[PDB]
Scaffold this active site. Structure first.
Site, PDB file in Angstrom:
ATOM      1  N   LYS A  50       0.820  -1.216   0.000  1.00 56.45           N
ATOM      2  CA  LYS A  50       0.000   0.000   0.000  1.00 56.45           C
ATOM      3  C   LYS A  50       0.855   1.268   0.000  1.00 56.45           C
ATOM      4  CE  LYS A  50      -2.738   0.891   3.420  1.00 56.45           C
ATOM      5  NZ  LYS A  50      -3.978   0.883   4.279  1.00 56.45           N
ATOM      6  N   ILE A  89       9.917  -0.318  -0.033  1.00 64.06           N
ATOM      7  CA  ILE A  89      11.051  -0.858   0.724  1.00 64.06           C
ATOM      8  C   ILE A  89      11.227  -2.337   0.421  1.00 64.06           C
ATOM      9  CG2 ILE A  89       9.763  -1.501   2.813  1.00 64.06           C
ATOM     10  CD1 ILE A  89      12.275   0.074   4.308  1.00 64.06           C
ATOM     11  N   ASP A  91      13.354  -5.585   2.045  1.00 64.38           N
ATOM     12  CA  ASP A  91      13.988  -5.916   3.321  1.00 64.38           C
ATOM     13  C   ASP A  91      14.316  -7.405   3.338  1.00 64.38           C
ATOM     14  OD1 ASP A  91      14.900  -5.808   6.030  1.00 64.38           O
ATOM     15  OD2 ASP A  91      12.858  -6.155   6.788  1.00 64.38           O
ATOM     16  N   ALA A  93      13.044  -9.483   1.322  1.00 63.97           N
ATOM     17  CA  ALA A  93      12.862  -9.816  -0.100  1.00 63.97           C
ATOM     18  C   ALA A  93      11.750 -10.845  -0.305  1.00 63.97           C
ATOM     19  CB  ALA A  93      14.149 -10.323  -0.767  1.00 63.97           C
ATOM     20  N   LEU A  94      11.050 -11.247   0.746  1.00 65.91           N
ATOM     21  CA  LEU A  94      10.025 -12.273   0.570  1.00 65.91           C
ATOM     22  C   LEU A  94       8.868 -11.774  -0.297  1.00 65.91           C
ATOM     23  CD1 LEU A  94      10.043 -13.964   4.098  1.00 65.91           C
ATOM     24  CD2 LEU A  94      11.054 -14.780   1.948  1.00 65.91           C
ATOM     25  N   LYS A 119      17.037  -2.325   2.236  1.00 62.15           N
ATOM     26  CA  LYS A 119      17.742  -2.640   3.467  1.00 62.15           C
ATOM     27  C   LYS A 119      18.536  -3.895   3.164  1.00 62.15           C
ATOM     28  CE  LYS A 119      14.963  -1.542   7.290  1.00 62.15           C
ATOM     29  NZ  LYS A 119      13.830  -2.024   8.133  1.00 62.15           N
TER      30      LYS A 119
HETATM   31  N1  LIG Z   1       7.412   1.429   7.775  1.00 62.40           N
HETATM   32  C1  LIG Z   1       8.324   0.383   7.532  1.00 62.40           C
HETATM   33  N2  LIG Z   1       7.922  -0.894   7.005  1.00 62.40           N
HETATM   34  C2  LIG Z   1       8.954  -1.897   6.824  1.00 62.40           C
HETATM   35  C3  LIG Z   1      10.292  -1.696   7.127  1.00 62.40           C
HETATM   36  N3  LIG Z   1      10.925  -2.834   6.809  1.00 62.40           N
HETATM   37  C4  LIG Z   1      10.001  -3.698   6.363  1.00 62.40           C
HETATM   38  N4  LIG Z   1       8.806  -3.115   6.376  1.00 62.40           N
HETATM   39  C5  LIG Z   1       7.453  -3.511   6.024  1.00 62.40           C
HETATM   40  C6  LIG Z   1       7.267  -4.616   5.014  1.00 62.40           C
HETATM   41  C7  LIG Z   1       5.815  -4.737   4.562  1.00 62.40           C
HETATM   42  O1  LIG Z   1       5.131  -3.585   4.968  1.00 62.40           O
HETATM   43  C8  LIG Z   1       4.408  -2.927   3.956  1.00 62.40           C
HETATM   44  C9  LIG Z   1       3.110  -2.535   4.625  1.00 62.40           C
HETATM   45  P1  LIG Z   1       1.932  -1.601   3.554  1.00 62.40           P
HETATM   46  O2  LIG Z   1       2.611  -0.482   2.830  1.00 62.40           O
HETATM   47  O3  LIG Z   1       0.891  -1.151   4.550  1.00 62.40           O
HETATM   48  O4  LIG Z   1       1.193  -2.531   2.613  1.00 62.40           O
HETATM   49  O5  LIG Z   1       8.057  -4.414   3.884  1.00 62.40           O
HETATM   50  C10 LIG Z   1       8.194  -5.712   3.376  1.00 62.40           C
HETATM   51  C11 LIG Z   1       9.384  -5.760   2.449  1.00 62.40           C
HETATM   52  P2  LIG Z   1      10.105  -7.467   2.439  1.00 62.40           P
HETATM   53  O6  LIG Z   1       9.096  -8.507   1.959  1.00 62.40           O
HETATM   54  O7  LIG Z   1      11.244  -7.352   1.461  1.00 62.40           O
HETATM   55  O8  LIG Z   1      10.552  -7.842   3.833  1.00 62.40           O
HETATM   56  C12 LIG Z   1      10.711  -0.345   7.662  1.00 62.40           C
HETATM   57  O9  LIG Z   1      11.834  -0.073   7.967  1.00 62.40           O
HETATM   58  N5  LIG Z   1       9.698   0.641   7.852  1.00 62.40           N
END
Ligand SMILES: Nc1nc2c(ncn2C[C@@H](COCCP(=O)(O)O)OCCP(=O)(O)O)c(=O)[nH]1
Ligand SMILES: Nc1nc2c(ncn2C[C@@H](COCCP(=O)(O)O)OCCP(=O)(O)O)c(=O)[nH]1
Lengths: 169, 169
Positions: A50, A89, A91, A93-94, A119
């Site tokens: 989102k 973002i 992180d 990578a899943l 990250k």
């Molecule tokens: N605000 C914030 N959210 C983070 C962070 N790291 C992972 N997330 C959230 C995480 C998922 O959150 C997104 C939530 P949405 O924007 O409400 O749909 O990112 C996933 C990436 P990945 O599958 O590579 O692990 C961070 O540092 N800050």
């Protein structure tokens, strides 16, 4: 710090936009060989999570400045089309591993990924985005679309959230 | 005209942002009585139509500048919460009438609408948005999130699309 809810500002909106322009030039160069065109052959932007709507809104406008026409889809027909997956973002990578694998089943012409914040130290599986606006260490950030419990997406900068905020919540 | 696909530019990105700042001041004033706060009591932004993501990204950042904290939902729990529905264009009003009526069933504290472009002459039912960034006559526009067959959303300005574009398509 200019915000009372943050301990550090990591990237300002101005810094992010400057890096986005550098990335857009690389994208324009890399896709110049593809004869992209509005309607007939746009780059398909697949915006994931989102929070990516802020990044996506800014990035497609910058890509248009650089002559890269797009159409947008949100995950929150590509057969034979070029797809660029955008995420605010990256992180573990899943998320992107699953999205890219799913889209591959529809056989796009190509598929690449663009993320606003990487990250690199957070991976649970190996994954490299083709295009990265900015790198962050293993810290929890908000702003530029990124939330804490649905708040703070509208902060114009990427910031480290104060521990007091999320204990006082 | 600076675009080869448009006959007229109606509102530049700069003009839109100036009007958005005027609207944001009115919103800030109108909701000052509500004690909005991140996490505890944000203004709930309900963004409607795929194209509204550009307007929504810019508007929530401007509202944050004016001290109005938000959380965003996309239609493309509010019980007891203030809801502001955002749409890039209001024309027949059939979309917003349905959205506002549906959200009313969840009994929000209040519900108001904010649109980027109003086409007052297009109504099929009476409907007035509380906040309007800009008015357009009964002409078909693209840009600032608005598409023609999924293209041109990324144009930074609101423009009248050339007839040649949509006959040559
Ligand atoms: N605000 C914030 N959210 C983070 C962070 N790291 C992972 N997330 C959230 C995480 C998922 O959150 C997104 C939530 P949405 O924007 O409400 O749909 O990112 C996933 C990436 P990945 O599958 O590579 O692990 C961070 O540092 N800050
Ligand atoms: N690009 C463009 N789209 C227009 C226009 N008028 C209505 N629409 C589209 C119409 C719906 O199109 C949105 C398509 P989406 O952004 O792809 O989801 O707006 C409906 C408002 P209404 O229910 O008040 O009638 C226009 O001038 N330009």
């Amino acid at each position: 710090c200019k915000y009372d809810f943050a301990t550090s500002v990591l990237f300002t909106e101005a810094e992010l936009h400057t890096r986005m322009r550098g990335v857009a030039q690389r994208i324009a160069d890399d896709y110049s060989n593809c004869n992209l065109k509005p309607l007939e052959n746009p780059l398909v932007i697949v915006s994931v999570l989102k929070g990516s709507f802020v990044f996506t809104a800014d990035m497609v406008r910058i890509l248009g400045d650089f002559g890269v026409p797009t159409r947008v889809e949100f995950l929150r027909d590509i057969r034979g089309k070029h797809v660029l997956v955008l995420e605010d973002i990256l992180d573990t990578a899943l998320t992107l591993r699953e999205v890219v694998d799913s889209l591959k089943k529809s056989e796009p012409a190509s598929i690449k990924t663009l993320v606003a914040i990487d990250k690199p130290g957070g991976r649970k599986i190996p994954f490299t985005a083709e295009y990265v606006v900015a790198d962050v260490p293993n810290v929890f950030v908000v702003g530029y679309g990124l939330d804490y419990d649905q708040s703070y997406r509208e902060v114009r900068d990427v910031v480290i959230l104060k521990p007091s905020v999320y204990e006082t919540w």
